Amino acid sequence: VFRDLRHYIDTLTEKLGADEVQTIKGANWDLEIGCITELSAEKEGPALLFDDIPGYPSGHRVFTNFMGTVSRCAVALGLPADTSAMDIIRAWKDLGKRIEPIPPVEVSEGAILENVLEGDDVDLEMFPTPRWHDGDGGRYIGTACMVITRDPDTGWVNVGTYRGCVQGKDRLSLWMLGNRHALAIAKKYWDRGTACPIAVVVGCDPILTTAAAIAAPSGVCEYDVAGGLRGVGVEVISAPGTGLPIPANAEIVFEGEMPPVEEESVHEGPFGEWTGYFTHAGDETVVRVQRILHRDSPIILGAPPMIPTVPAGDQAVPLYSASVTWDHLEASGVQNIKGVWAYARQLMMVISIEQTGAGDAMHALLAAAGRKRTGGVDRYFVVVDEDIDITDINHVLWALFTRVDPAESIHVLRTPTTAIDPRLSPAKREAGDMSMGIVLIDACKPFAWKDSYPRANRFDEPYRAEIRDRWKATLPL
Amino acid sequence: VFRDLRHYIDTLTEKLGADEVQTIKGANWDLEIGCITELSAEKEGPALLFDDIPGYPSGHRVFTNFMGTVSRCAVALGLPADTSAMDIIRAWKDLGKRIEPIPPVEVSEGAILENVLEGDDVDLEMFPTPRWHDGDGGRYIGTACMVITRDPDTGWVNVGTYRGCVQGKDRLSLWMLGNRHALAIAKKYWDRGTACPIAVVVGCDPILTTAAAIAAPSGVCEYDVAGGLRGVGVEVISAPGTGLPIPANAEIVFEGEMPPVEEESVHEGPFGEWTGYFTHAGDETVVRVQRILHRDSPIILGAPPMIPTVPAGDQAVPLYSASVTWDHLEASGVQNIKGVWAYARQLMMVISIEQTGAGDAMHALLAAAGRKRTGGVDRYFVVVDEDIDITDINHVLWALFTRVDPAESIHVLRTPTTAIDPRLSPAKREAGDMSMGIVLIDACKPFAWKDSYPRANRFDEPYRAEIRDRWKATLPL
Amino acid sequence: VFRDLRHYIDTLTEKLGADEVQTIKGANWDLEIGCITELSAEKEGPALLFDDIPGYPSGHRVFTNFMGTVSRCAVALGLPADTSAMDIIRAWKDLGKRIEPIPPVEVSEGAILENVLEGDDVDLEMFPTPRWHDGDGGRYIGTACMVITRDPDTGWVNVGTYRGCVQGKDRLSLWMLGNRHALAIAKKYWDRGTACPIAVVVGCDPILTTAAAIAAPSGVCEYDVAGGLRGVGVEVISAPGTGLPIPANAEIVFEGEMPPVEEESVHEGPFGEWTGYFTHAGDETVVRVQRILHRDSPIILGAPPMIPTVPAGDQAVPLYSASVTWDHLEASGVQNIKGVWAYARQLMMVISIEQTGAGDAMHALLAAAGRKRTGGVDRYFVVVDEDIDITDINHVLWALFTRVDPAESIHVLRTPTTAIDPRLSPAKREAGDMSMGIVLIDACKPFAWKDSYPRANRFDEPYRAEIRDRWKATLPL
Numbered sequence A, B, C: 001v002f003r004d005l006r007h008y009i010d011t012l013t014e015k016l017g018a019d020e021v022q023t024i025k026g027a028n029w030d031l032e033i034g035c036i037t038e039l040s041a042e043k044e045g046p047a048l049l050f051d052d053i054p055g056y057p058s059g060h061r062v063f064t065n066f067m068g069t070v071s072r073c074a075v076a077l078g079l080p081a082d083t084s085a086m087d088i089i090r091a092w093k094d095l096g097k098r099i100e101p102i103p104p105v106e107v108s109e110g111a112i113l114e115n116v117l118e119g120d121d122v123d124l125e126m127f128p129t130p131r132w133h134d135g136d137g138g139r140y141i142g143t144a145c146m147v148i149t150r151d152p153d154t155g156w157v158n159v160g161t162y163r164g165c166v167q168g169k170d171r172l173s174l175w176m177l178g179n180r181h182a183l184a185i186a187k188k189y190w191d192r193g194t195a196c197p198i199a200v201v202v203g204c205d206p207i208l209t210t211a212a213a214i215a216a217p218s219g220v221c222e223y224d225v226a227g228g229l230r231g232v233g234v235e236v237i238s239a240p241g242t243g244l245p246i247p248a249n250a251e252i253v254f255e256g257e258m259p260p261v262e263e264e265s266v267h268e269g270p271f272g273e274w275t276g277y278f279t280h281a282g283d284e285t286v287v288r289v290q291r292i293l294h295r296d297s298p299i300i301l302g303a304p305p306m307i308p309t310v311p312a313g314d315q316a317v318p319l320y321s322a323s324v325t326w327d328h329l330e331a332s333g334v335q336n337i338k339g340v341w342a343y344a345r346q347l348m349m350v351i352s353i354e355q356t357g358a359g360d361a362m363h364a365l366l367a368a369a370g371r372k373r374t375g376g377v378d379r380y381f382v383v384v385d386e387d388i389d390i391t392d393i394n395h396v397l398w399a400l401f402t403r404v405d406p407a408e409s410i411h412v413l414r415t416p417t418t419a420i421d422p423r424l425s426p427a428k429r430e431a432g433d434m435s436m437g438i439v440l441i442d443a444c445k446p447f448a449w450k451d452s453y454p455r456a457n458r459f460d461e462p463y464r465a466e467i468r469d470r471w472k473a474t475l476p477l
């Protein structure tokens, strides 16, 4: 529950020390910002606040890696700064069950109205938008962002997150996969020979984009869902030109209309997919930007895609993957679950149970492998006992390294993949052949003889936590 | 919604002709009744009403195979006599979602009070109980039955179905698997050095035992659930001796108490498990029978176990298996489901989808294989396209025979089984080794080339149904 | 040993009651007859005798499903109406060994001469020929039929069964696979610039077509073989126009000549292959029909292809498949064979042995899998112990469901298939790639521990037969 981006940054330095966010002066938008973000992300550095970008006025800032740590996700979710990775999951999972839609609160004034820019004054190049990676088609101002549209017939307002590239001083490309709600709406104003009116937020309260990104059902306005996660409706404004609701204290908004493909498209160069590879460039859907709103010292909220095994700068904890699988395991009557986690979004799913029967391990693997398809590359599935910290790749590895008989525990299944999968050959795709496969890896102590298992040389968790909280100041631990 | 067994039999002959139930005179309780039931069941004969059993008074009857057909399950569920097998599933599945507990209705009079028998008059041998199979430990009067107990502290009343063998003129053995609600309750009166008071119904309205058998949650009195499936609470009576609620128009009730194992057990010979094999004999939990209630011409409702690939005389349609898997496939986001069915309870699960993507088939297989473990022998899983009648073993076979590449479509998975599995070796069990396996068989037309699939030489379903309903009288069809 | 079709129908109602054959009035040749045949066949109804077909004179009849039951095959083979399925096999197998060629008996008069039709009077459309399935290329009067030709040089007369479609009022298409004896002969009269003279029988004594269908060696006139199975030579007539021998009391004969492909072909639409799929339409070999002979109230003997897992209306017992495999198992020194059966012609072969050694089961599987290739789709092979009724799909299933360890007993072999196989992809065929595979499934009680196998809950066979023959009238059983 944040007022705006700045309340969030503050909150971070309140709960974590002034070191938790660090301001960087004189990095360049071209490659340099992105490359810093990527390395800092790998090293779980501070959240980065980029200032005095050469060619740009002071306070014209970029904020990256803003939720690229466990402890950060906890603050953002407003739990104790020191809440465990798996506790966050437990929390998220259970929030899921007790949240009702709380609508946005109208509100009359707000920081978004400090600088409004119309007709000629509309220059997208005014922002210090980075070119995040060599090979991007342009500069992607719209990453951790909101794309807002209103259904004209009902009045549902849908906020989702589509990549937005700067295509000129008044054009912003968006890429929406076929099935996107924004597009569903959009087509109402097309089959009526108007444009589809749209606003697009490119910096603001991260809880809001956390929500924009949530795969909310149709008809359901993800503004409400945000209200749900914070507990009070979000402070909002009729955008002047289009009427659409935008955040009162947002950082930067573009308003205006998006016509049909057949009338104006632009070339939307590649950008990185979630699997850590560049997707395809095409002629994409573009928006004519008619208004720019921005606060003084406007910050862009930047989440450029990284390879998925790097901490994800916009939520390092895999909230959705971990939690939704966990609900499926329960529904699938798997028992004594101690934890569910995902590395690289969903490419290794990990499950920690307490085995009470011979079939538990294989039952959890098949359960996890059969859950609701999402992003359509699946690969590894790993079950382990209740003494493995599955949020700690090292610990999971040691289990894969020391509790797996490869002749018995590795189950390679031959199954199809999806076009998105970087490992499908041109020859295969073209022939409609989607064969890939998955691995079910049973890394559990064998049940028949579990009590006879060699004992781990490692401190128990309680003690680990006694020493941690005792040697708090002194030493990272 | 039946008044009693006799309303049900009537209903059967009303909806199906007087041929649907047939009365059999002069078969013997020893083997002969059972053996007739088994063959008639295989041939989907009439529901059998056994009369003039030698050594027994007229009207002392046995009723078997009472729901051993699709069309019978439909009448019992009170849908059109001619409702399709899969329509029944669709119905059951959806009833599941709209039923609330409707409690039993007290009622003052009823047919159960025509003959009450106390102290010396209590002779279990009075009933023409069959010895259903050679190898049964005795005569099993308690098959399609209700075992009623009341929790003394709360007052929850639990009705479940445990095998009941006649162990003398006043003793009835029951076998309850460790985790049975009756036993949960029972242990309250043991840890208090009283017996556990119990009544046991051995003939009555089959909807009632349909419900007794439903794996209802703890705390939940499956009398209510019966109320749910019929739409009105069930007509019921405080049994005189124990207070427990029993059906007003029931056929035969035994009331009395069951002490702890350590005080009186009996040898409870084998009887057939659901997998079509004899389980183990042991010293079992026994009930001292103190009252016998029975109507004039009392009928025993008999469901002896058959091998599971025979039509199950007590519900030939696999209501629970088919429906609960279907809910899991939905939850697991499998789509365009046309049908789910099970042969031999759950040993082949079959799923009919309409493929819209390369991964559908394997996704449905894994989804089904990971669902909530129940009876703990799993074996085959089969997915097919939307033109297969999966309720017709012949049609499913032809798909397994003509749409499976064995080198690509048969996925043998190595997984553990449970002690109940007749194929686990003594050597394995003793060593705690439960290895068995399952098969995922993709019997779908290959998606990459589906439109090029050879065309089936078989009448479309609409036409099949035009000719069927047109040539109705004339010819079985 | 039947006089003609009518002696056969009679024989059926003599041995089985008047219910065994049922006369159907006012079904239409277009689809309706076929669709009734198919459903009645699935339900093992009566043999169907179709009368008063709209547009057609009375007694112009169609007879289907004429041998679509075990008990029917027994009557046809003239054994006790109640001979077991496997007894029929045992009988067939052993007949095979004691039959010598008994030639046809000349005879002077016969029912075939009641109506002869020449030049203009030749109208094939006169018969109430059904269009058996939607998708057939025309109406297939020639299904359960005889195609008779005489070798001009030697005088061998060959009768085989090729599909015959009505192609006009005086043209009948035949499709002969490359290697067919009729064609072998035919080519003698082509390489001599005459037509090949031919007669084609389309209703008659079913023993005769049983024989026409028998894959008799070259040089061997399958008229003789018929003599062998009945014990007396068959009553026969020089057809007037061509001289060829035809049955004295046949129902319907067409006589005339068939020229070479290059001189007159017709389009021979698809019809159903034995694997339950439509084959390819092509330009086919046609016969110019010059004579029509028919008895008063002439019946067409109709065996339309059904999917192979339906009871085959023309012999539900798989005489040839079951018996010839059985001889191979013997020759392959497999021992204590109790039974061999086939479902869907040959797509699951089943073998029942009495195991006396560790290697028996796998030895029977490989033996069966290596036998003489016939129709060129093979798929499943199943061995079981001597207590399985392998003629009862339910019983075989329960064995596959409860006696197979999938991790040990399922042997998938990678082997090529043939073009006929509906599951081979266009891409594969075109590349000359015939990979498919087969499964060897050992469903035997494991020998090492067989005596410890859980005991079947099912009535022994003797008793099953005591109750069956005791409760004969009373109840189907």
Ligand SMILES: Cc1cc2c3c(c1C)C(C)(C)CC=[N+]3c1c([nH]c(=O)[nH]c1=O)N2C[C@H](O)[C@H](O)[C@H](O)COP(=O)(O)O
Pocket (backbone or CB within 6 Å): A142, A143, A144, A158, A159, A160, A161, A162, A163, A164, A175, A176, A177, A178, A179, A180, A181, A182, A212, A213, A214, A215, A216, A303, A304, A305, A314
């Ligand atoms: C978090 C997030 C989600 C992206 C996304 C990105 C991020 C960071 C980017 C900016 C890094 C790369 C682009 N993204 C796209 C995307 N969906 C889409 O169709 N096109 C995209 O370009 N999504 C998915 C989208 O955010 C969620 O699936 C929404 O719930 C879908 O919105 P909707 O349900 O209202 O249609």
Ligand SMILES: Cc1cc2c3c(c1C)C(C)(C)CC=[N+]3c1c([nH]c(=O)[nH]c1=O)N2C[C@H](O)[C@H](O)[C@H](O)COP(=O)(O)O
Pocket (backbone or CB within 6 Å): B142, B143, B144, B158, B159, B160, B161, B162, B163, B164, B175, B176, B177, B178, B179, B180, B181, B182, B212, B213, B214, B215, B216, B303, B304, B305, B314
């Ligand atoms: C339909 C049915 C279910 C049997 C059953 C049978 C049938 C026909 C028989 C009579 C053929 C063989 C015996 N049965 C037993 C049984 N559960 C058990 O612990 N012991 C048994 O002997 N069950 C299971 C029981 O009916 C259901 O699982 C109940 O929902 C469990 O009751 P509860 O939930 O109240 O404890």
Ligand SMILES: Cc1cc2c3c(c1C)C(C)(C)CC=[N+]3c1c([nH]c(=O)[nH]c1=O)N2C[C@H](O)[C@H](O)[C@H](O)COP(=O)(O)O
Pocket (backbone or CB within 6 Å): C142, C143, C144, C158, C159, C160, C161, C162, C163, C164, C175, C176, C177, C178, C179, C180, C181, C182, C212, C213, C214, C215, C216, C303, C304, C305, C314
């Ligand atoms: C029983 C039977 C066998 C058919 C047959 C059918 C049936 C019902 C039909 C009518 C349903 C479909 C068509 N059939 C053809 C066929 N052989 C062939 O080359 N073309 C066919 O069209 N055969 C095979 C033929 O009957 C036997 O293989 C003969 O033994 C071969 O005759 P021959 O040995 O004298 O050449």
Ligand SMILES: [Mn+2]
Pocket (backbone or CB within 6 Å): A158, A159, A160, A181, A215, A216, A217, A218, A220, A222
């Ligand atoms: Mn949405």
Ligand SMILES: [Mn+2]
Pocket (backbone or CB within 6 Å): B158, B159, B160, B181, B215, B216, B217, B218, B220, B222
């Ligand atoms: Mn219960």
Ligand SMILES: [Mn+2]
Pocket (backbone or CB within 6 Å): C158, C159, C160, C181, C215, C216, C217, C218, C220, C222
């Ligand atoms: Mn021949």
Ligand code: NA
Pocket (backbone or CB within 6 Å): A159, A160, A161, A211, A212, A213, A214, A215, A216, A222
């Ligand atoms: Na969204």
Ligand code: NA
Pocket (backbone or CB within 6 Å): B159, B160, B161, B211, B212, B213, B214, B215, B216, B222
């Ligand atoms: Na119950």
Ligand code: NA
Pocket (backbone or CB within 6 Å): C159, C160, C161, C211, C212, C213, C214, C215, C216, C222
């Ligand atoms: Na032949």
